[PDB]
């Protein structure tokens, strides 16, 4: 397993883009050697406008490699108009610089269909139940999912969301999994599965409620 220095550049999450209205993009560089020098990581915009102060972050990994990230805030309108942002990575040990670019993404648009389910009780799990959410037939593939219980949004660490996979049609689908406790559904037996997607009209939101005991 040789370690190859690779770079990645994400798009803003629909949540940061449409809800918090604080969109950001992140340049991720992996498989760096700690004992080697540090990388120079710079940004550029197609419009020629200046870029904002990005926030840099480095992390030692268990597999003995270094991970460098740079997060850049972008204008909401700028991004949506269809601006192109670029990240460039240089290292004296790297033969050739790395460059990745990101943009709005174009193509057909379809709002997501949301379905929420609760698992029946299992022998053993007296006080645990699992909630699941199917979100499908949306495009493009960018989508954000949150879980709300008692009108407050749960921490992102409480639930797991799969990556977008292609349907047999043209759209995409994702699954979301949320483990809940008796204390929670007894306080209030309503859990909201919310999806944020650019094609959802209006306010880029679609959601469904589910109950353990209906």
């Amino acid at each position: 397993n040789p370690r190859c220095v690779s770079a990645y550049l994400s798009r803003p999450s629909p949540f940061d883009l449409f809800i918090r209205k604080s969109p950001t993009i992140t340049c991720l560089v992996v498989d760096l050697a700690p004992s080697k020098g540090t990388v120079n990581l710079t940004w550029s915009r197609a419009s020629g406008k200046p870029v904002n102060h990005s926030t840099r972050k480095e992390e030692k990994q268990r597999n003995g490699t270094l991970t460098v990230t740079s997060t850049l805030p972008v204008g909401t309108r700028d991004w949506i108009e269809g601006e192109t942002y670029q990240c460039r990575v240089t290292h004296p040990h790297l033969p050739r610089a790395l460059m990745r670019s990101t943009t709005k993404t174009s193509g057909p648009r379809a709002a997501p269909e949301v379905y929420a389910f609760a698992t029946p009780e299992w022998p053993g799990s007296r006080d645990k139940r699992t909630l699941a959410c199917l979100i499908q037939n949306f495009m493009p593939e960018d989508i954000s999912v949150q879980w709300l219980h008692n009108e407050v949004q749960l921490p992102d660490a409480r639930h797991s969301t799969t990556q977008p996979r292609k349907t047999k049609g043209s759209g995409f689908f994702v699954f979301s999994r949320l483990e809940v406790t008796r204390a929670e559904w007894e306080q209030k037996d309503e859990f909201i599965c919310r999806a944020v997607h650019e094609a959802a009209s209006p306010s880029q939101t679609v959601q469904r409620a589910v109950s353990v005991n209906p």
Partner: antibody
């Protein structure tokens, strides 16, 4: 998507003047990018003529500088090329193009169809 | 001014063949870890289309069979598998120093 359409071409008398206009749609010429004029005389290669960036900074090719002006009209989302003292060698297809930025330098990512300027008596 | 020379001036190649176009600059177009040479494609009756910018980066929507390489004063455009629609004149262009300048062009004809 961005579209660029040139107009003002056609016949011009030798020693006469020229006014070309590039109508831009889909994007605002004050919002960003560079905006250039490039010409191509018959059976010959491409010559960059002039440019104006979104903040108004202008630049010209010394080959034709001094009898040339580039300018814009924000309300019309249009920019212009003005040339005087035309000669037969100025006969060419004139393209307008939007330059995209890459770490201090521009490249012409979007072009119009170009318009033919014919200098003849 | 930075002068650009292309070779060959003209070539004829069959569908599926590899085509190689060279661009030489009178001075280096390197700056800050990148080489600022651009490649354009001009089909008949149409305006030039950007294929590659900054030596090796492919413009969006451009077929992958187009690729660029080189640095300093030596640059190469490669068409890995020639197609009938690739019939065009190809231009290199430096954006490192004003005035921006183009090569004289390379005519690519299809042998059939």
């Amino acid at each position: 998507e961005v579209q660029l359409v040139e107009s003002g071409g056609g016949l011009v008398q030798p020693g006469g003047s020229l006014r070309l206009s590039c109508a831009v749609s889909g994007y605002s010429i004050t919002s960003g990018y560079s905006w250039n004029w490039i010409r191509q005389a018959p059976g010959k290669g491409l010559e960059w003529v002039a440019s104006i960036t979104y903040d108004g900074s202008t630049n010209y090719n010394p080959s034709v500088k001094g009898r040339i002006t580039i300018s814009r009209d924000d309300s019309k989302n249009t920019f212009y090329l003005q040339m005087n003292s035309l000669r037969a060698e100025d006969t060419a297809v004139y393209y307008c193009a939007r330059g995209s930025h890459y770490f201090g330098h521009w490249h012409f990512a979007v072009w119009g169809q170009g318009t033919l300027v014919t200098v003849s008596s | 001014d930075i002068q650009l020379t292309q070779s060959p001036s003209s070539l004829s190649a069959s569908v599926g063949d590899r085509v190689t176009i060279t661009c030489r600059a009178s001075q280096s177009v390197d700056y800050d870890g990148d080489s600022y040479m651009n490649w354009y494609q001009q089909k008949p009756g149409k305006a030039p289309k950007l294929l590659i910018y900054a030596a090796s980066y492919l413009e969006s929507g451009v077929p992958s069979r187009f690729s660029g390489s080189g640095s300093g004063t030596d640059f190469t455009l490669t068409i890995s598998s020639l197609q009938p629609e690739d019939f065009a004149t190809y231009y290199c262009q430096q954006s490192h120093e004003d005035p921006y300048t183009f090569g004289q062009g390379t005519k690519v004809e299809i042998k059939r």
